[PDB]
């Protein structure tokens, strides 16, 4: 079945970081898949489906996701790119990224509008403590959930703005970024195309629910691998992957990228952070 | 270490009246009067169901949520009923109609404000909060609805403090109500995702108690209640005061939950022999293991047997050594390893309390965490799912304001509830 | 020279309480003496205001008792971080305060419940503060170790494998009662199937008197804190040595009372009084603290042992010449006024670190296997600032503790 695609990105150590240790490489390389933890002891193996260096910035990195960003709309269904590591690891350098080196979000919109009848509406949200914010429209807390008949959930008070620019829709999406400038953050873009739908989501990652939700997931890929891959899913315990469950449960790519720091010092927070992507 | 009763809907006044009856003779307190006790013991810790204004009238800290008022009138103008201050009632002369909805989403929506308000007045007073029992049944409007949204709430308002809830699930055998499936289908999903401890209590499972372990030919609701009442004090009070082994809500709670779909739990009696006849003392400490362990003296319709353990807290309250009690405990996790799971070496947790109930000398409240309540959320499922299916009352429900999603909600959630239960059962 | 004790836990506070009876009581001071050294700490009122309210409530400083009036949990997780640690500054304090007050101290004294919240949380952290600002003494702690089957908390291995993990690096001698194996001491060398916790306590706080207090006075072969840790502890691992007592007579059956060294020396190497479920069914002995009180004649100590040491069943670890500390105390034991103990002129309070210990620690890494394979009450420490890597972590560290204690022996 769809396995999350797992890719690792490493940065490149802080002016400061680096000032301080030279750790950079703390983790070793063998094969474009894994790597191999070997930190001045402890010894450990992270297999992934891709690898990217300490040296590669964002723009190596965004390209590979642009390919499986631009196809999504060909897919039919949902999309969705988890962002894992540690606090400034490079997850907003890698999703939204600097005014000079864009992230995998402003080129996603960017070539979205490109090959664009097609209708894309503009979702951006915010969950903080189980609850969601709209980060779209500055005036504002409680959001709402509905849910169809069937019982598949969907966001509901969400606003939703439909984009007529390449730019606007990145323009739109950095107002709410703009306001969280600790939480999980997701963008949600329904493409239209005359009816095949596709939904790219752009999330993240970062109280009870930060705990909860992380366990869950690990609890949900570990139960949905064994299912997987020989003769309970956990999705109702936790609200956020409930949402997502048309994405995970139904046919559709999930790429996660986990991007880390090859400090040394960092190692503890880096096996944890690869630990909840995969293992070997 | 303090706690908020809050009894809503009819029924919940009705169980909460007779509880406060039992309770204050468990600490010596008389309507108007003080502290009476007989002995020093049930002073140290009054404060966790009482409140200090006047002196002498140690005001309990419960709060009666009920759209009729001849239901809340007949609570205040009986016995023990002159206790509860004006402002802890909560009433609304609105439609106390039998309806989910209409005690959900209008005249009960209406009420909530006002409930909000006396909640944190409560939860405000003094020393630590714990967390907010609530006493309720799944087949009527103010007890399935109103009761459910109060919870909900507070849940949002104190994610910290547990919630202990005792609901009187719509016995199986025979129904009090014709919705009453609809409503507690509707009540059990919001439940199950607010609570963090639930007892369940049978109407048909209490009637038996009082038929075969009690000699009593007329057992009426104020018996009933007298039994369940017994029962929350070995939970909630008896945890308050000293002991060699004492526990409390969080000990319990975190060794009674293994899964945060919150489980639940039935309550069980261990002296439970007839007055006169039966009155052979034979409570040494095996006997309440025979009692307590028993198919019949389960609260609850289901069976035991019909499902494996996954959590037990035997409470005890009396003089005894903690060799005879936890020897006996293993002795049955030994001798029934059928049924009393297979990913856990010992369920049961021991407590041990000091002082027993005024007039007894040795006793045990018992709450069992098995699987077998699935043969009672099934027969929810069963009964809800088959009028479902014609819609029978849904004009009662859609006219007040609801949604046809609403039902799947709930259905699927409670059904899922029962898988959940079965996924560990085996 | 002296030596403060922390009480920590449901237990560790009843334990205490029994202990410090006792204490008083074969030193002459009543409830109105003078000050003890030792402090009480537990996250639920009632638990230390029994002592507050019951018998000798005014022998102690409202300032070495020390509460949090929230909630006790009984969750290691809880009971360490979210509430713990709000606690240890107040409660560190009073370790430092006291600890400066005395007159060269040599350690101090851990009371802890290993399956419990603040015995198994509180301590941990406690004790991880005091490694580093008291590195350079004992550290010594009794531990109530679960008992195999007889088991209190559902959660009880989970609370056990963490608190483990973080003191196994931090303790240097730790001192474990079984509670199992005191049941049924009580059953078969007492014969009562009443012996409620202060009863089992009394024993217990029988066998610290010995301990401690014995040690601090004078007698014919004194031994202090240091000498433990260095004669107990071959390697810098905590390792887990047990208690003995051997005069566990009846003050009603049995009459046997003049109990020569020769029998009362080797009614200890009986897995049937050794206060522990840890049975020497392959457990190999390497080193061994024979602490005698009361009226003891060294020749007939040089010889018990040495009957013993040419006994072969009582097989002792390769890497072992001779692993006997001597302890010749003057005191005599000391019976508790209406117990249920003889009352001997001599006691033999037994203490070694055997590689039976592997057993009863293997019943309770399958436990905490066995229930952490469904995650079962996991949710309870993760919401309280936890997760999934300390737990593997301890899983990971537990298991060298089940090597080391198969390396150190089981070959030679
Ligand atoms: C002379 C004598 O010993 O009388 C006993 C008695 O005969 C028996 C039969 C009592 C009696 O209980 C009942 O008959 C009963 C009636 C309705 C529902 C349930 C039970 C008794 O009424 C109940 C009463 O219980 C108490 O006093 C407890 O403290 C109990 N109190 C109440 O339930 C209570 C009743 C009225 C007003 C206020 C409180 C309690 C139990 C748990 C937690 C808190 C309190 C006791 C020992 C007796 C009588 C008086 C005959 C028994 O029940 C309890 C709860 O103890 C029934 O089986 C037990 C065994 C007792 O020996
Ligand atoms: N010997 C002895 N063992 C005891 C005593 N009290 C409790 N225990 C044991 O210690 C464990 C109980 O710990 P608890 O009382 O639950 O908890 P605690 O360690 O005090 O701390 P909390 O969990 O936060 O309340 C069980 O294994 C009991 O069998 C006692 O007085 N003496
Ligand atoms: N044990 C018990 N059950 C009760 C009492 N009163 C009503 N019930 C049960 O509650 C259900 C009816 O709900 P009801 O309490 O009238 O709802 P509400 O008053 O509209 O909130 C039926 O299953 C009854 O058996 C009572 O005093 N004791
Ligand atoms: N691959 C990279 N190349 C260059 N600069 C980077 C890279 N990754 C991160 N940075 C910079 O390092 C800092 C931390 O990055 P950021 O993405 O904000 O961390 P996080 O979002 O993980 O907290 C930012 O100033 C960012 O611009
Ligand atoms: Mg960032
Ligand atoms: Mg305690």
């Given at each position: 079945?769809?396995k999350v695609?797992?890719?690792?990105?490493?940065?490149?150590?802080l002016?400061?970081?680096l000032?301080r240790?030279?750790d950079?490489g703390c983790?070793?390389?063998e094969?474009?898949?894994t790597?191999?933890?070997?930190?001045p002891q402890?010894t450990?193996?992270?297999?992934?489906?891709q690898?990217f260096?300490?040296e590669?910035g964002?723009?190596?990195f965004?390209n590979?996701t642009m390919?499986?960003?631009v196809?999504?709309?060909?897919k039919?269904?949902n999309?969705?790119?988890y962002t894992?590591?540690?606090?400034?690891?490079g997850?907003?350098?890698?999703?939204?990224?600097?005014s000079?080196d864009?992230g995998?979000?402003?080129?996603s919109?960017?070539l979205?509008?490109?090959?664009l009848?097609?209708?894309?509406?503009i979702?951006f949200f915010e969950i903080?403590?189980?609850?969601?914010?709209?980060?779209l429209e500055?005036?504002?807390q409680?959001?709402?959930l509905?849910?169809?008949?069937?019982?598949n959930?969907?966001?509901?008070?969400?606003?939703?703005?439909?984009?007529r620019?390449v730019?606007?829709?990145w323009?739109?999406?950095?107002?709410?970024r703009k306001?969280?400038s600790?939480s999980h953050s997701i963008?949600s873009i329904?493409?239209?195309?005359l009816?095949?739908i596709?939904?790219?989501s752009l999330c993240?990652?970062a109280?009870?629910?930060?705990?909860?939700?992380?366990?869950?997931?690990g609890?949900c890929?570990?139960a949905?691998?064994?299912?997987?891959?020989?003769?309970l899913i956990?999705?109702?315990?936790?609200?956020?992957?409930?949402v997502?469950?048309?994405?995970?449960t139904?046919?559709?790519?999930?790429?996660?990228?986990v991007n880390?720091?090859?400090?040394?010092?960092?190692y503890?927070?880096?096996?944890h952070?690869?630990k909840?992507?995969?293992?070997? | 270490?303090?706690i908020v009763?809050?009894?809503?809907g009819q029924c919940g006044?009705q169980i909460?009246?007779k509880?406060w009856?039992?309770?204050s003779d468990?600490?010596?307190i008389d309507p108007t009067?003080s502290?009476?006790?007989?002995?020093?013991?049930q002073?140290?810790?009054?404060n966790?169901?009482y409140n200090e204004?006047?002196?002498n009238?140690?005001?309990?800290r419960?709060?009666?949520?009920d759209?009729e008022?001849?239901?809340m009138?007949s609570?205040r103008?009986?016995?023990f009923?002159?206790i509860?201050?004006?402002?802890?009632?909560v009433?609304?002369?609105?439609?106390?109609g039998?309806n989910?909805?209409k005690?959900?989403y209008?005249?009960g929506?209406?009420?909530?404000?006002?409930?909000?308000?006396?909640?944190?007045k409560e939860s405000?007073?003094?020393?630590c909060?714990?967390?907010f029992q609530?006493?309720?049944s799944?087949?009527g409007?103010?007890?399935?609805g109103?009761?459910?949204?109060?919870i909900?709430?507070?849940?949002?308002?104190?994610?910290?403090?547990?919630?202990?809830?005792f609901?009187v699930?719509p016995?199986?055998?025979v129904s009090?109500?014709?919705?009453?499936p609809?409503?507690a289908?509707?009540?059990?999903?919001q439940?199950?995702?607010?609570?963090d401890?639930?007892?369940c209590?049978?109407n048909e499972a209490?009637y038996?108690?009082?038929?075969?372990?009690?000699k009593?030919?007329?057992p009426?609701?104020?018996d009933?209640?007298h039994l369940?009442?017994?029962?929350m004090?070995?939970?909630?009070?008896?945890?308050?005061?000293?002991?060699?082994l004492?526990?409390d809500?969080?000990?319990l709670?975190?060794?009674?939950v293994?899964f945060?779909?919150?489980?639940f739990?039935?309550?069980?009696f261990?002296?439970?022999?007839?007055?006169g006849?039966?009155q052979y003392?034979?409570?040494?400490?095996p006997?309440?293991?025979?009692?307590?362990?028993?198919?019949?003296?389960?609260?609850?319709?289901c069976?035991?047997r019909h499902?494996?353990?996954?959590?037990v807290?035997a409470?005890?309250?009396?003089?005894?050594?903690?060799?005879?009690?936890?020897e006996?405990?293993?002795?049955?996790?030994?001798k029934n390893?059928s049924y009393?799971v297979?990913?856990?070496?010992?369920?049961?947790?021991?407590?041990?309390?000091d002082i027993?109930?005024?007039?007894?000398?040795?006793s045990?409240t018992?709450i069992?965490?098995?699987?077998?309540?699935?043969e009672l959320?099934?027969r929810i499922?069963?009964?809800?799912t088959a009028m479902?299916?014609?819609?029978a009352?849904?004009?009662?429900?859609?006219?007040?304001?609801?949604?046809?999603m609403?039902?799947?909600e709930?259905e699927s959630?409670?059904?899922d509830?029962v898988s959940?239960?079965?996924?560990?059962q085996d | 020279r002296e030596?403060?004790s922390i009480?920590?836990?449901?237990?560790?506070?009843?334990?205490?309480?029994?202990?410090?009876?006792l204490?008083?009581?074969?030193?002459?001071?009543?409830?109105?003496?003078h000050?003890?050294?030792?402090?009480?700490?537990d996250?639920?009122p009632?638990?230390?205001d029994?002592v507050?309210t019951?018998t000798?409530?005014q022998?102690?400083?409202?300032?070495?008792?020390?509460?949090?009036?929230?909630?006790?949990?009984?969750?290691?997780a809880?009971?360490?971080y979210?509430?713990?640690?709000?606690?240890?500054?107040?409660?560190?304090?009073?370790?430092r305060?006291?600890?400066?007050?005395?007159?060269?101290l040599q350690?101090f004294?851990?009371f802890?419940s290993f399956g419990?919240g603040?015995?198994s949380?509180?301590?941990?952290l406690l004790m991880?503060?005091?490694?580093?600002?008291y590195g350079?003494?004992?550290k010594?702690?009794?531990?109530i170790?679960?008992a195999?089957?007889?088991?209190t908390?559902?959660?009880e291995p989970?609370n056990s494998?963490?608190?483990?993990?973080?003191?196994?690096?931090?303790?240097?001698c730790?001192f474990?009662v079984?509670?199992?194996?005191?049941y049924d001491?009580?059953?078969?060398n007492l014969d009562?199937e009443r012996?409620?916790?202060t009863?089992?306590n009394?024993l217990?706080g029988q066998?610290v008197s010995s301990?401690?207090?014995?040690?601090?006075?004078?007698?014919?072969?004194?031994?202090?804190l240091?000498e433990?840790?260095?004669?107990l502890?071959p390697?810098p691992?905590?390792?887990?040595?047990?208690a003995?007592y051997?005069?566990?007579?009846?003050?009603?059956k049995?009459?046997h009372?003049?109990?020569?060294?020769?029998?009362?020396?080797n009614a200890?190497?009986e897995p049937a009084?050794?206060?522990?479920?840890?049975?020497?069914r392959?457990?190999?002995?390497?080193?061994?603290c024979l602490?005698?009180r009361g009226?003891?004649?060294?020749?007939?100590?040089?010889?018990?042992?040495?009957?013993?040491?040419?006994?072969?069943?009582?097989?002792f670890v390769?890497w072992?010449p001779?692993?006997?500390?001597?302890?010749?105390?003057y005191?005599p034991p000391?019976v508790?006024?209406?117990?249920?103990?003889a009352?001997?002129?001599?006691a033999v309070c037994?203490?070694?670190?055997t590689?039976?210990?592997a057993?009863?620690?293997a019943r309770?890494?399958?436990?905490?296997d066995?229930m952490?394979?469904?995650?079962?009450?996991?949710?309870?420490?993760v919401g309280?600032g936890?997760e999934?890597?300390?737990?593997?972590?301890?899983?990971?560290?537990?298991?060298?503790?089940?090597?080391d204690?198969?390396?150190v022996?089981?070959?030679?």
């Amino acid at each position: 079945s769809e396995k999350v695609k797992v890719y690792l990105r490493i940065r490149p150590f802080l002016t400061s970081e680096l000032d301080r240790q030279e750790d950079q490489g703390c983790v070793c390389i063998e094969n474009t898949e894994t790597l191999v933890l070997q930190a001045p002891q402890a010894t450990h193996k992270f297999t992934f489906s891709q690898i990217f260096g300490p040296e590669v910035g964002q723009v190596a990195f965004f390209n590979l996701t642009m390919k499986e960003m631009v196809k999504d709309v060909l897919k039919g269904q949902n999309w969705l790119i988890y962002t894992y590591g540690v606090t400034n690891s490079g997850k907003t350098y890698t999703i939204q990224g600097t005014s000079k080196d864009a992230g995998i979000l402003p080129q996603s919109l960017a070539l979205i509008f490109n090959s664009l009848r097609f209708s894309v509406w503009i979702s951006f949200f915010e969950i903080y403590n189980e609850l969601l914010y709209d980060l779209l429209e500055p005036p504002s807390q409680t959001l709402r959930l509905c849910e169809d008949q069937n019982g598949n959930p969907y966001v509901k008070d969400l606003n939703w703005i439909h984009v007529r620019d390449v730019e606007e829709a990145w323009k739109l999406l950095k107002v709410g970024r703009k306001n969280q400038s600790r939480s999980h953050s997701i963008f949600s873009i329904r493409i239209l195309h005359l009816p095949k739908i596709s939904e790219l989501s752009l999330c993240d990652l970062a109280a009870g629910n930060i705990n909860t939700s992380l366990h869950t997931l690990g609890r949900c890929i570990a139960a949905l691998r064994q299912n997987q891959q020989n003769r309970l899913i956990p999705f109702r315990d936790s609200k956020l992957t409930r949402v997502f469950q048309g994405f995970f449960t139904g046919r559709g790519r999930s790429c996660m990228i986990v991007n880390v720091n090859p400090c040394a010092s960092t190692y503890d927070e880096t096996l944890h952070a690869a630990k909840f992507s995969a293992l070997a | 270490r303090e706690i908020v009763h809050i009894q809503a809907g009819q029924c919940g006044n009705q169980i909460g009246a007779k509880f406060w009856e039992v309770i204050s003779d468990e600490h010596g307190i008389d309507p108007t009067g003080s502290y009476h006790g007989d002995s020093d013991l049930q002073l140290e810790r009054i404060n966790v169901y009482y409140n200090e204004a006047a002196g002498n009238k140690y005001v309990p800290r419960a709060i009666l949520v009920d759209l009729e008022p001849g239901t809340m009138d007949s609570v205040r103008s009986g016995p023990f009923g002159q206790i509860f201050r004006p402002d802890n009632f909560v009433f609304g002369q609105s439609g106390a109609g039998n309806n989910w909805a209409k005690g959900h989403y209008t005249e009960g929506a209406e009420l909530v404000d006002s409930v909000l308000d006396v909640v944190r007045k409560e939860s405000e007073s003094c020393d630590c909060l714990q967390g907010f029992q609530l006493t309720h049944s799944l087949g009527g409007g103010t007890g399935s609805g109103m009761g459910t949204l109060l919870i909900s709430k507070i849940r949002e308002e104190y994610p910290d403090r547990i919630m202990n809830t005792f609901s009187v699930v719509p016995s199986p055998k025979v129904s009090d109500t014709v919705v009453e499936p609809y409503n507690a289908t509707l009540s059990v999903h919001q439940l199950v995702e607010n609570t963090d401890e639930t007892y369940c209590i049978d109407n048909e499972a209490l009637y038996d108690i009082c038929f075969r372990t009690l000699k009593l030919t007329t057992p009426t609701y104020g018996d009933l209640n007298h039994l369940v009442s017994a029962t929350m004090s070995g939970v909630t009070t008896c945890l308050r005061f000293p002991g060699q082994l004492n526990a409390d809500l969080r000990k319990l709670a975190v060794n009674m939950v293994p899964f945060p779909r919150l489980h639940f739990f039935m309550p069980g009696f261990a002296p439970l022999t007839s007055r006169g006849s039966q009155q052979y003392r034979a409570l040494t400490v095996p006997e309440l293991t025979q009692q307590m362990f028993d198919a019949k003296n389960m609260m609850a319709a289901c069976d035991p047997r019909h499902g494996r353990y996954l959590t037990v807290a035997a409470v005890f309250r009396g003089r005894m050594s903690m060799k005879e009690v936890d020897e006996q405990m293993l002795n049955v996790q030994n001798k029934n390893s059928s049924y009393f799971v297979e990913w856990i070496p010992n369920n049961v947790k021991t407590a041990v309390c000091d002082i027993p109930p005024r007039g007894l000398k040795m006793s045990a409240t018992f709450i069992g965490n098995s699987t077998a309540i699935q043969e009672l959320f099934k027969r929810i499922s069963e009964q809800f799912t088959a009028m479902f299916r014609r819609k029978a009352f849904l004009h009662w429900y859609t006219g007040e304001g609801m949604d046809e999603m609403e039902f799947t909600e709930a259905e699927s959630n409670m059904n899922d509830l029962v898988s959940e239960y079965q996924q560990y059962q085996d | 020279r002296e030596c403060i004790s922390i009480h920590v836990g449901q237990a560790g506070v009843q334990i205490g309480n029994a202990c410090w009876e006792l204490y008083c009581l074969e030193h002459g001071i009543q409830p109105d003496g003078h000050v003890p050294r030792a402090v009480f700490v537990d996250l639920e009122p009632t638990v230390i205001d029994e002592v507050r309210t019951g018998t000798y409530r005014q022998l102690f400083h409202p300032e070495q008792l020390i509460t949090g009036k929230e909630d006790a949990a009984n969750n290691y997780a809880r009971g360490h971080y979210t509430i713990g640690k709000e606690i240890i500054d107040l409660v560190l304090d009073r370790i430092r305060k006291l600890a400066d007050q005395c007159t060269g101290l040599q350690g101090f004294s851990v009371f802890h419940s290993f399956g419990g919240g603040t015995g198994s949380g509180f301590t941990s952290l406690l004790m991880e503060r005091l490694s580093v600002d008291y590195g350079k003494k004992s550290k010594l702690e009794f531990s109530i170790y679960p008992a195999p089957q007889v088991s209190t908390a559902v959660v009880e291995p989970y609370n056990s494998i963490l608190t483990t993990h973080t003191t196994l690096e931090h303790s240097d001698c730790a001192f474990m009662v079984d509670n199992e194996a005191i049941y049924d001491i009580c059953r078969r060398n007492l014969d009562i199937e009443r012996p409620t916790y202060t009863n089992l306590n009394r024993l217990i706080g029988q066998i610290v008197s010995s301990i401690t207090a014995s040690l601090r006075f004078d007698g014919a072969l004194n031994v202090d804190l240091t000498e433990f840790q260095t004669n107990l502890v071959p390697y810098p691992r905590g390792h887990f040595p047990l208690a003995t007592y051997a005069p566990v007579i009846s003050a009603e059956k049995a009459y046997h009372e003049q109990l020569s060294v020769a029998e009362i020396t080797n009614a200890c190497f009986e897995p049937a009084n050794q206060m522990v479920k840890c049975d020497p069914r392959h457990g190999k002995y390497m080193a061994c603290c024979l602490l005698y009180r009361g009226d003891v004649v060294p020749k007939d100590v040089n010889a018990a042992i040495a009957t013993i040491k040419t006994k072969r069943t009582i097989q002792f670890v390769d890497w072992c010449p001779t692993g006997f500390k001597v302890g010749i105390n003057y005191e005599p034991p000391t019976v508790v006024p209406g117990g249920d103990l003889a009352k001997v002129q001599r006691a033999v309070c037994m203490l070694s670190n055997t590689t039976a210990i592997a057993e009863a620690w293997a019943r309770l890494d399958h436990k905490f296997d066995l229930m952490y394979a469904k995650r079962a009450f996991v949710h309870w420490y993760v919401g309280e600032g936890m997760e999934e890597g300390e737990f593997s972590e301890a899983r990971e560290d537990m298991a060298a503790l089940e090597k080391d204690y198969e390396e150190v022996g089981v070959d030679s």
